[PDB]
From a paper:
We selected a humanised Fab fragment, FabT, which binds and potently neutralises human TNFα as an acceptor scaffold. The unmodified FabT fragment bound TNF with a KD of 221 pM and did not bind either HSA or MSA (data not shown). To determine whether the CDR conformations of FabT-aHSA and FabT-aMSA align with those of FabT, attempts were made to crystallize all three proteins. Conditions for crystallization were identified for FabT and FabT-aHSA but not for FabT-aMSA. The structure was determined by molecular replacement using the coordinates of an unpublished in-house Fab.
We have previously shown that the knob domain can function independently of the antibody scaffold to create an autonomous fragment of just 4-6 kDa. From these immunisations, knob domains which bound to human and rodent albumins enabled engineering of chimeric bispecific Fab fragments, via grafting into the heavy chain variable region (VH) framework III loop of a TNFα neutralising humanised Fab. By this route, neutralisation of the canonical antigen (TNFα) was retained but extended pharmacokinetics in-vivo were achieved through albumin binding.
Numbering used by the authors:
A (entry chain A): 1 to 222
B (entry chain B): 1 to 213
The structure:
């Protein structure tokens, strides 16, 4: 239908600059403004500003003018959020959004893109299997998973079987290790009777390190 | 700017309860008020606009009321899929401003956890670290005690826990406890066990394995 798709997040150093993009589809781009909103724990949701794609006129929350600039490229049906002179406390999920229609609230949201402002370096994860065994199988159900360890910054995404397996999946919130790197596990419960005929692959993506790993999780003989 | 104050910041209630969340603006916004619902990690979803009109697809148990500075969101009969954080937003003057959110949790009946353990993978051991994962699946309430014992010696300081968001269908939780050791420390011991205490279990449950087996 109407869709907004963001790109460009990830890691940036304090004082640095970063540009996000918002590609609009499913409607005539110039018929509605594009707005930008961010979300972080503590200050919550904050509205940054809008741009009118027909005139390229942008209007801002005064609070944000020193670090944020909104622009458009009509040829690409895209709006952009340019960030400058970023502070560590500007770490947040950034959304583009569109009104339902003129003067109405926001019915359509981009997926959100986390921007992490930090001096630490990017690190891609290692992916290890959590293989089903007699110790994770009971009552006709087997649990299996993937351990995704030692990455920075957030986030990693995990899918199973390229998105075809969603039922029974638990992808846990990441924990911060004392090393300063993150870890998480993703687990799924499936029939124990099916382990010999079905294939279970965890698809791990860590965009900041350009890491994409597929790990086939095979049963353990214990 | 117009400041939006929501109350309460969090609440928990049972299926079938009538729940109310309030939003107060620092000045009259003349019914120019929206409500959004957000699940963890997901986008906000528009629920209500013009203070009392439900958006496409929103169940009739939701309602919005109020005028002037004071507005209310009411869920007439709470359902498990209503677990979420709810935000108000004034749409009357720029800058657009949002309330701080109300996190809504569900109370329900006891459900005992299924307990599973995963020894470290051969792949990880080749690199010099050993992670042992204990999984408590689909249980209620969230409170649970997980203890690690290595050759029957109680561990402390080498594990971390993570709990899932509450399930949108059955209101249960899952929990991981991960014990991390250097490969050398791991090879100093034989028996690795996760002991789980929970209200739904008549006695503590232990899942265990022997290193190297």
């Amino acid at each position: 239908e109407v869709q907004l798709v963001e790109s460009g997040g990830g890691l940036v150093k304090p004082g640095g600059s970063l540009r996000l993009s918002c590609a609009a589809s499913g409607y005539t781009f110039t018929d509605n403004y594009i707005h930008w909103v961010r979300q972080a724990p503590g200050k919550g949701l904050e509205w940054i500003g809008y741009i009118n794609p027909s005139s390229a006129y942008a209007h801002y929350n005064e609070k944000f003018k020193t670090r944020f600039t909104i622009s458009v490229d009509k040829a690409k049906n895209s709006a952009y959020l340019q960030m400058n002179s970023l502070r560590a406390e500007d770490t947040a999920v950034y959304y583009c959004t569109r009104r339902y229609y003129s003067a109405m609230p926001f019915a359509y949201w981009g997926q959100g893109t986390l921007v992490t402002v930090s001096s630490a370096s990017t690190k891609g994860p290692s992916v290890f299997p959590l293989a089903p065994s007699s110790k994770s199988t009971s009552g006709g159900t087997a649990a299996l998973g993937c351990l995704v360890k030692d990455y920075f910054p957030e986030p990693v995404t995990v899918s199973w079987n390229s998105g075809a397996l969603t039922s029974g999946v638990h992808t846990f919130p990441a924990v911060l290790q004392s090393s300063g790197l993150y870890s998480l596990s993703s687990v799924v419960t499936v029939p124990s009777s099916s382990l010999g005929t079905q294939t279970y692959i965890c698809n791990v993506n860590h965009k900041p390190s350009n890491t994409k790993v597929d790990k086939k999780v095979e049963p353990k003989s214990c | 700017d117009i400041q939006m104050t929501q109350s309460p910041s969090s609440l928990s209630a049972s299926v079938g309860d009538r729940v109310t969340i309030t939003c107060r603006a620092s000045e009259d916004i003349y019914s120019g008020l929206a409500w959004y619902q957000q699940k963890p990690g997901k986008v906000p979803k528009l629920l209500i606009y013009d203070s009392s009109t439900l958006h496409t697809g929103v169940p009739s148990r939701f309602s919005g009321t109020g005028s002037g500075t004071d507005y209310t969101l009411t869920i007439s009969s709470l359902q498990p899929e209503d677990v979420a954080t709810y935000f108000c937003q004034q749409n009357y003057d720029f800058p657009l401003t949002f309330g701080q959110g109300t996190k809504l949790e569900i109370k329900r009946t006891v459900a005992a956890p299924s307990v599973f353990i995963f020894p470290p993978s051969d792949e990880q051991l080749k690199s010099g670290t050993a992670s042992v994962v204990c999984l408590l699946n689909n249980f209620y309430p969230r409170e649970a005690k997980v203890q690690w014992k290595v050759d029957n010696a109680l561990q402390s300081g080498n594990s971390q826990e993570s709990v899932t968001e509450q399930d949108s269908k059955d209101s249960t939780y899952s929990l991981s406890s991960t014990l991390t050791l250097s490969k050398a420390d791991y090879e100093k011991h034989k028996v690795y066990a996760c002991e789980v205490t929970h209200q739904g279990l008549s006695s503590p449950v232990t899942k265990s394995f022997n290193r190297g087996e």
